[PDB]
Design a protein around this ligand. Structure first.
Ligand SMILES: *[C@@H]1O[C@H](CO[C@@H]2O[C@@H](C)[C@@H](O)[C@@H](O)[C@@H]2O)[C@@H](O[C@@H]2O[C@H](CO)[C@@H](O[C@@H]3O[C@H](CO)[C@@H](O)[C@H](O)[C@@H]3O)[C@H](O)[C@H]2NC(C)=O)[C@H](O)[C@H]1NC(C)=O
Lengths: 212, 108, 213
């Protein structure tokens, strides 16, 4: 079966280099044009670079020409992406894709994530969003890298919970809120605690959210 | 690029079909890669810069924007649709075009 | 260089209905190297159609494509629940290989106006020197919404940031936050903080506001 498996992604600071690898199986690798395609968070697909059958011809998007280099090794059936002079905007999922003989990109790997940041690993600060329906929540501010998880009352409160996707702030740190709507009558009867876990920093915060 | 090839050709008694495959417009290129595909299996492929040396059943010559293909060794079971693929490989842009296919009739 | 423009941005439909997605290409190129891909959250793109009208391997028959020259369409004859996804077109006849911006096929439901809530910064946060003001728009449909921040009645620009959930699995609505970030210094300068929401389920904008303190 045709498989493509990317590797090498991770966190890197602007200005440095990273090499990605794509392992091809299940077809005669040398008989196909191969590509890298990327997808920045919340955005569409952007072709980055492609490479001819025998490796002689390399094609680049203007955005990466001069900084990224593509190569292939047809004896070990691997595609590479050498990324240099990385920038924040190069943060993306990087997919390896085969070109079918009729021209389309007929198989794709699952992708490998590249994060280009100057930020240091940092757990969030958690602040209350204080309250016949009431809304309340927790603001989960200034953490890096992703992800953070949020539950309410250790998982027992799920109805009406919305935990928003993170936003990357100008500072390079992420932020998100988790919110829940509840009976305004329950505000004096029940306790509402958000459980924030940011495993990259081994941090776990429980924050009680009270009226006033 | 638009690739043109004849809708139908008749192979000879001796199992040889010849037909042109042509592309337009004539973009600047130094290397043109031609593939014959049978509907997908690869019949032969070559790069022009007289071709198909890796493929005893295929030969071809390339002039202007037209390849004169010859496919030999054909038998009645080989009757089928043979697509011409043309690539303008370098310098960029890369271009690829698929012909609509030549139906080759072979009689034993 | 070939630019592709997809329309609509979002198609809103129910299972069993027909989806028609359009892709317009900058130039004709003498044949139709036009492909369509499906993408679900957290997954790689999947080839559906190529050469404008050919189905790729293992793709269900309800997917079809048509068109020529510059104008192409993807049709899902009778939508299935597994088909709500993002769809991209792509031209692959020349480098740079280029893609459309994507069309989201989402579940259609009735209009639902948002419930709107405003949150002042916490005292704990202000002690740290920054003030986050949050506006919540809860369980609304359709997705389109305008959130305008006004402070003392001046309109704000460049100091807010929005986030939206995916369509809810039970009620097919969206929820949205808008977060206004000010310095404590600037937060303390002003008095009226207000969030004004325009949405289809609201005859006229709703405003939620508080007075600092
Ligand atoms: C490669 O083949 C395509 C597709 O041809 C279509 O499918 C084949 C299996 C046959 O059944 C053909 O009969 C059929 O057209 C060709 O594209 C087609 O080209 C024609 C000619 O320019 C286009 O024009 C048509 O003109 C008539 C009369 O004015 C109209 O009524 C039609 O609606 C149409 O506009 C036609 O649109 C176009 N079709 C598609 C799907 O692209 C293509 O020309 C051919 N290429 C070469 C080099 O031969």
């Amino acid at each position: 079966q045709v498989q493509l498996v990317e590797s090498g992604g991770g966190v890197v600071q602007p200005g440095r280099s990273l090499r990605l690898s794509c392992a091809a199986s299940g077809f005669t690798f040398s008989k196909y044009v191969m590509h890298w395609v990327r997808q920045a968070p919340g955005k569409g697909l952007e072709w980055v670079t492609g490479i001819s059958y025998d490796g002689r011809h390399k094609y680049y998007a203007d955005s990466v020409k001069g900084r990224f280099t593509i190569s292939r090794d047809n004896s070990k059936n691997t595609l590479y992406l050498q990324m240099n002079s990385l920038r924040a905007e190069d943060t993306a999922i990087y997919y390896c894709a085969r070109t079918g003989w009729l021209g389309p990109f007929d198989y794709w790997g699952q992708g490998t994530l590249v994060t280009v940041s100057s930020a240091s690993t940092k757990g969030p600060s958690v602040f209350p969003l204080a309250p016949g329906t009431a809304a309340l929540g927790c603001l989960v501010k200034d953490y890096f890298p992703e992800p953070v998880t949020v539950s309410w009352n250790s998982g027992a409160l799920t109805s009406g919970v919305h935990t928003f996707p993170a936003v990357l702030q100008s500072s390079g740190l992420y932020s998100l809120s988790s919110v829940v709507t509840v009976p305004s009558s329950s505000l004096g009867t029940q306790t509402y605690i958000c459980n924030v876990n940011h495993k990259p920093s081994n941090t776990k915060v429980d924050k009680r959210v009270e009226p006033k | 690029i638009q690739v043109t090839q004849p809708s139908v050709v008749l192979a000879s008694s001796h199992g040889v079909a010849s037909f042109p495959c042509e592309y337009s417009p004539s973009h600047n290129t130094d290397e043109v890669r031609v593939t014959v595909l049978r509907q997908m299996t690869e019949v032969c492929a070559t790069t022009f810069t007289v071709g198909f040396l890796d493929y005893p059943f295929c030969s071809g010559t390339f002039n202007e924007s037209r390849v004169n293909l010859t496919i030999q060794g054909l038998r009645a079971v080989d009757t089928g649709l043979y697509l011409c693929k043309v690539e303008l490989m370098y310098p960029p842009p890369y271009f690829v075009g698929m012909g609509n296919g030549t139906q080759i009739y072979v009689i034993d | 260089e070939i630019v592709l423009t997809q329309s609509p941005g979002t198609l809103s439909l129910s299972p069993g209905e027909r989806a028609t997605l359009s892709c317009r290409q900058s130039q004709s190129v003498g044949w139709s190297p036009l492909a369509w891909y499906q993408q679900k959250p957290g997954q790689a793109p999947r080839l559906l159609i190529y050469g404008a009208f050919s189905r790729a391997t293992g793709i269900p028959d309800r997917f079809s494509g048509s068109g020529s020259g510059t104008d192409f369409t993807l049709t899902i004859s009778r939508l299935e629940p597994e088909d709500f996804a993002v769809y991209y077109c792509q031209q692959y006849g020349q480098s740079p290989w280029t893609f459309g911006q994507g069309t989201k096929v989402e579940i259609k439901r009735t209009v639902a106006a948002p419930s709107v809530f405003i949150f002042p910064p916490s005292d704990e946060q202000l002690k740290s020197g920054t003030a986050s003001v949050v506006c919540l728009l809860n369980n609304f449909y359709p997705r389109e919404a305008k959130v305008q921040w006004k402070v003392d009645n001046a309109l704000q620009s460049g100091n807010s940031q929005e986030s939206v959930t995916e369509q809810d699995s039970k009620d097919s609505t969206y929820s949205l936050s808008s977060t206004l970030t000010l310095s404590k210094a600037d937060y303390e300068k002003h008095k009226v903080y207000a969030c004004e929401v325009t949405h289809q389920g609201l005859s006229s904008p709703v405003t939620k506001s508080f007075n600092r303190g």
